[PDB]
């Protein structure tokens, strides 16, 4: 009936207001805080009427019409406001860009912050949301609400501490780092969903969730993947209220179905809404079932291999991804995707022959050189920095020698991050190195692909921007 009324009552006023502020800040990144506050309040006001009387005028309008109409009021160029829904929202999405950069934020001194945090906490936390949102327009909105809660907690403790800055600053820098990374992953997800569609995102998610929930049935994992995809499609299309509502529903579903999913969720599911979701998304892999058969039975020897591949390519390749990933939590997701790609390419060729099995019988031998390529390239650079030290320089020389068409101070910023990769990931054992290393690395490269797209200067880097082979692309270039 009333969409605003529905979400308002689902989300609650405090989260409703916060999510709306984020929506507005991510679209109109250059508007001053005080403007957004007004629009938010107006919108929230309107929503409160609809809650009391769902029949009230304008209460049956779509969220994009309502909010798009509010945004287009305020006296960065936009011919978007000349357009009607659904075109309008699409135009707003296109003009959203993480490239348009504002000056860095200069924090007041700790005493002044803590003081402001005490005199008006609501505005203080609002300003936080506004500032992150406008600087990171692709930030996963329901996750930003949790950052805010962590931000609020950091000020709740540290403001009474002996050395406020000694307590607070490391917490605020950590939060900043996690926010930068979180923002980077999400931007990658949005790029893929926006350009390609769901397929690439769903392959990644089948891989990822099968490592995390090894004991879940394929249909269960698949149901979770579908839900997650819906959550992220809405977020990437600026349906933040729907996004947050569905994420909460997904957390509730997972907690009610722990027995079909994972034994490691008990604790997560006792926590409060915002951190329950964060917890589930960060939960560690469950242990795989004990006596799983080899993959050869279902994927090589089975007489129905080609039949399964022909009748439902995505399902079959999804089952391959699932069965493989659940056995290999030590692999990176991109490796698992390259193997699935290899397997698919082999079937596309052989399932045409008179005797297909003859053709693809040794398909798993193709996987050997693939699994080793990242296992070494890591071992080598991990040992090379086990005798070199963090203080980064060697990487600067190589990568710049590869592509010197990019800005100089930007190239140094990338090298610093690269040094942070081997800084922590080499500390963990071998069966946990690839996951954190090769995946994060592929994210750092997206930060590189997007920044360069704004000011084009090279033709070699832009060619890289397949999400799976993005590493072998830049890693091989001489």
């Amino acid at each position: 009936k009333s969409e605003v009324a529905h979400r308002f009552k689902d989300l609650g006023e405090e989260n409703f207001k916060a999510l709306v502020l984020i929506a507005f800040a991510q679209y109109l990144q250059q508007c001053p805080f005080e403007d957004h506050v007004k629009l938010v309040n107006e919108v929230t006001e309107f929503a409160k009427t609809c809650v009391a009387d769902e029949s009230a005028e304008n209460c049956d309008k779509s969220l994009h019409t309502l909010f798009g109409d509010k945004l287009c009021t305020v006296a960065e160029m936009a011919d978007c406001c000349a357009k009607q829904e659904p075109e309008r929202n699409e135009c707003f999405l296109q003009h959203k860009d993480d490239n348009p950069n504002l000056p860095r934020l200069v924090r007041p001194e700790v005493d002044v912050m803590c003081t402001a945090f005490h005199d008006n906490e609501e505005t203080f936390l609002k300003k936080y949301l506004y500032e992150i949102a406008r600087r990171h327009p692709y930030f996963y909105a329901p996750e930003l609400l949790f950052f805010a809660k962590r931000y609020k907690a950091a000020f709740t403790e540290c403001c009474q501490a002996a050395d406020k800055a000694a307590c607070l600053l490391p917490k605020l820098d950590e939060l900043r780092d996690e926010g930068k990374a979180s923002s980077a992953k999400q931007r990658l997800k949005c790029a893929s969903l926006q350009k390609f569609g769901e397929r690439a995102f769903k392959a990644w998610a089948v891989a990822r969730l099968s490592q995390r929930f090894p004991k879940a049935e394929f249909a269960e994992v698949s149901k979770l993947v579908t839900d997650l995809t819906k959550v992220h499609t809405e977020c990437c299309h600026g349906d933040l209220l729907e996004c947050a509502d569905d994420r909460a529903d997904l957390a509730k579903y997972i907690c009610e179905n722990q027995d079909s999913i994972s034994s490691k969720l008990k604790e997560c599911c006792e926590k409060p809404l915002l951190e329950k979701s964060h917890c589930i998304a960060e939960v560690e892999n469950d242990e795989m079932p004990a006596d799983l058969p080899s993959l050869a039975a279902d994927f090589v020897e089975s007489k129905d291999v080609c039949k399964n591949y022909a009748e439902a390519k995505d399902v079959f390749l999804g089952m391959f991804l699932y069965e493989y990933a659940r056995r290999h939590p030590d692999y990176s997701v991109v490796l698992l995707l390259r193997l699935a790609k290899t397997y698919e390419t082999t079937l596309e060729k052989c399932c045409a022959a008179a005797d297909p099995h003859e053709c693809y019988a040794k398909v798993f031998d193709e996987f050997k050189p693939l699994v080793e390529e990242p296992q070494n390239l890591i071992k080598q650079n991990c040992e090379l920095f086990e005798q070199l030290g963090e203080y980064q320089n060697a990487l600067l020389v190589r990568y710049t020698k590869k592509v010197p068409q990019v800005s100089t101070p930007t190239l140094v910023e990338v090298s610093r991050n690269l040094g942070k990769v081997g800084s922590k990931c080499c500390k963990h054992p071998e069966a946990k190195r690839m996951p954190c290393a090769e995946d994060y690395l592929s994210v750092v490269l997206n930060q590189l692909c997007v920044l360069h797209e704004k000011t084009p200067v090279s033709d070699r880097v832009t060619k890289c921007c397949s999400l799976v082979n993005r590493r072998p692309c830049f890693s091989a270039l001489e």
Binding site: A219, T226, E256, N257, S260, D314, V315, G318
Partner: protein, 103 residues
């Protein structure tokens, strides 16, 4: 895309024959497979059921519709049943459920 499950609730005696229908709706991708789950009175969890014995399933790919029939109800049958559908594109979703209750 979503799965419409009907009826939402049912009353029957022991020995009755009962049918549940699910339709995969609002999608352009064909129905590939189906699954059924039982949530016992208590409801903390669902368990997948096997289509054998007194349990039957009919699938019509043309209407993306499918049906579960329980032929001779026994006391352990009274529970909540959920259907799940998977499209050939791996879209997977669940019906809202059927409460099967004794008269």
């Amino acid at each position: 895309t979503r799965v419409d499950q009907s009826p939402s609730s049912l009353s029957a005696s022991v020995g009755d024959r009962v049918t549940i229908t699910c339709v995969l709706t609002d999608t352009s991708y064909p129905l590939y497979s189906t699954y059924w789950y039982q949530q016992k009175p208590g409801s903390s969890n669902k368990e997948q059921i096997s289509i054998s014995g007194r349990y039957s399933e009919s699938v019509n790919k043309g209407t993306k519709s499918f049906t579960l029939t329980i032929s001779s109800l026994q006391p352990e049958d009274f529970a909540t049943y959920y259907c799940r559908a998977m499209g050939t594109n791996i879209w997977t979703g669940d019906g809202a459920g059927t409460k099967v209750e004794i008269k």
